[PDB]
Amino acid sequence: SGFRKMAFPSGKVEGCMVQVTCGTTTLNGLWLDDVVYCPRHVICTSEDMLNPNYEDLLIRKSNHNFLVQAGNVQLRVIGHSMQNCVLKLKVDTANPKTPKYKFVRIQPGQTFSVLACYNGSPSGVYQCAMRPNFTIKGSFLNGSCGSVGFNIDYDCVSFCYMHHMELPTGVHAGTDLEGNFYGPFVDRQTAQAAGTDTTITVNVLAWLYAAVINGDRWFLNRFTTTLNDFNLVAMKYNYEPLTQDHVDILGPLSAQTGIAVLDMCASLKELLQNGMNGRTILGSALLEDEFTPFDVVRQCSGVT
Amino acid sequence: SGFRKMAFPSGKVEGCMVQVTCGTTTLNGLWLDDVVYCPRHVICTSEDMLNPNYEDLLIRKSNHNFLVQAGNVQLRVIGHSMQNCVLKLKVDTANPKTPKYKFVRIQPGQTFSVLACYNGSPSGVYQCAMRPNFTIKGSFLNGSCGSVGFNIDYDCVSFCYMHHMELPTGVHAGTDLEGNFYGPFVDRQTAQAAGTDTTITVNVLAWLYAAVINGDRWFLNRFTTTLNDFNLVAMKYNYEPLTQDHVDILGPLSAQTGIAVLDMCASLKELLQNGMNGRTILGSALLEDEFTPFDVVRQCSGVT
Ligand SMILES: *CC(=O)N1Cc2ccccc2[C@H](c2ccccc2)C1
Ligand SMILES: *CC(=O)N1Cc2ccccc2[C@H](c2ccccc2)C1
Numbered sequence A, B: 001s002g003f004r005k006m007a008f009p010s011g012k013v014e015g016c017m018v019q020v021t022c023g024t025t026t027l028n029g030l031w032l033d034d035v036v037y038c039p040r041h042v043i044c045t046s047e048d049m050l051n052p053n054y055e056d057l058l059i060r061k062s063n064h065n066f067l068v069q070a071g072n073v074q075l076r077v078i079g080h081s082m083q084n085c086v087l088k089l090k091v092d093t094a095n096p097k098t099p100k101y102k103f104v105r106i107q108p109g110q111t112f113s114v115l116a117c118y119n120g121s122p123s124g125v126y127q128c129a130m131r132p133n134f135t136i137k138g139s140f141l142n143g144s145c146g147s148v149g150f151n152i153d154y155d156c157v158s159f160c161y162m163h164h165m166e167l168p169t170g171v172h173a174g175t176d177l178e179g180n181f182y183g184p185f186v187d188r189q190t191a192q193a194a195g196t197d198t199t200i201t202v203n204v205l206a207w208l209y210a211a212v213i214n215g216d217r218w219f220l221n222r223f224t225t226t227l228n229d230f231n232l233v234a235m236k237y238n239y240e241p242l243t244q245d246h247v248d249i250l251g252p253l254s255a256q257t258g259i260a261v262l263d264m265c266a267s268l269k270e271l272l273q274n275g276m277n278g279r280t281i282l283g284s285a286l287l288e289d290e291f292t293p294f295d296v297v298r299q300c301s302g303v304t
Helices: A054-059 A201-213 A227-236 A244-257 A261-274 A293-301 B054-059 B201-213 B227-236 B244-257 B261-274 B293-301
Strands: A017-022 A025-032 A035-039 A066-070 A073-075 A077-083 A086-091 A100-103 A111-118 A121-129 A148-153 A156-166 A172-175 B017-022 B025-032 B035-039 B066-070 B073-075 B077-083 B086-091 B100-103 B111-118 B121-129 B148-153 B156-166 B172-175
Touching (some): A017 A121, A025 A066, A054 A077, A066 A086, A111 A156, A201 A293, A227 A261, A244 A293, A293 B121, B017 B121, B201 B244, B227 B261, B244 B261
Antiparallel strands (some): A017 A025, A017 A066, A111 A121, A156 A172, B017 B025, B025 B035, B035 B086, B111 B121, B148 B156
């Protein structure tokens, strides 16, 4: 029993973190096979970040300008290319700790673990969600750029995020491992505001199921609702509209608990309309939305 | 910017997790050098757990009854001994992935990372505190016993916890790596109630400092207080009494922010007396107490 915000074990990814230095900028790189992936803004001075022309800036860079260090050992760069907002540094040595991996571009509402690194060295691991506004609420200081987000399925690391920038509101923007930003963000020191940070309704419902499974039940009520009625309430509270797809995904938690998805929706509706009245659910005083249905099933079943 | 509940990177500990099977009970072991550490209740049937005599039960066990598997490879047990509530299984092979380590017994209020494992395989990592009542609020299913809690200082893993049992209230009890329980708990399926779960005042104040550092400031007020006055309020709200030792420990965060510890105490006092009025602090609607001052400085400075 007990339900915790849980990250994947980070070892497989720790084995992939390197330091990339171009001129006087140091950030993190991901070493998979004989390629090191890092944010293209490694080639910028903070001066350059106001309005960089990366193709023009990159012409001034050679293989030998990219200093790549894995622990205390330097990697030889034999090639470099820009793909969208990442650089791919070809090195002469395959990373011997390369796990089985994929690059996936995640949808908003999907959760992943972040291995926060500085100078190619891990500082910590925590769990995030891709927000509906394509920001993440991370913990990232200067030097953390090139830190990656990932899921693990048994033996296969799915890399979904590389950290690139902090908005002036202190939320985070980045790319998939093809260097394409999530959302409308650009790797430039300009005015970029996040849209509405909507609540991930399907994740709140998953987490309500997790609460029932772990003994927190005070918010169960005598009511039910419809998708359309529930969605009127979601709109009012800046919740994502609940679809039948979300209902289908919650089916296993519904089955396990014997609480119909629409009954749990009616519980969530009363919580939105009435608040928690100073009570808590799995040690939270607000409605948690960074556990997916798949996360609740995984943690509640003990998958490894 | 951004402040997250952050675990240590788990790789160094992932390298130490093994499966221990005695008869029909499987749980996790920690392999350091040529010793595997695991909970002594590995030798029990669930029947035995009602009133086990571990010394008597252990007489019926030989080296060859302890099946120790590191991934898919079996370790040869050449010795076994009971130290308090753990078994130490001597194996014929030193763990080649043994990191630099220490065993520390932590004080209540101290935080650590848990690597939740099942069958010697990692499922996830999360951050805990030793509660003032010597429970932890974990996420532990059957098979999770022998999962360990740890801190890392650069290259040295300090192992502070091994998971042993769940109380009927769904909080967690365990031992240090010498097999001594935290608090009054015993490895027996009996009536064991946790004492008052008091709030770790010094950790709330640290986290209030973390909030200021990361832009959340609405709770700063025009007031100050004294240790004695603050402590009257702490008593009323089941907070740990604040000592000058706690004030001294918060000195660096005080210095960095320019907010006197006693002014932040007066802020915490108004939060206790008045609630959050539906507002949040670092995305929490309650006062977080599982970040130590040392945790706030580490995360806010980017230590690796
Ligand atoms: C995440 C990180 O390490 N950054 C520091 C940095 C140093 C030098 C150049 C760029 C950057 C990153 C950045 C990206 C976009 C806009 C401003 C700054 C951030
Ligand atoms: C944590 C764990 O794996 N447990 C399962 C278990 C199986 C067999 C014997 C004992 C246990 C553990 C336990 C400890 C004390 C009281 C009851 C159960 C728990």
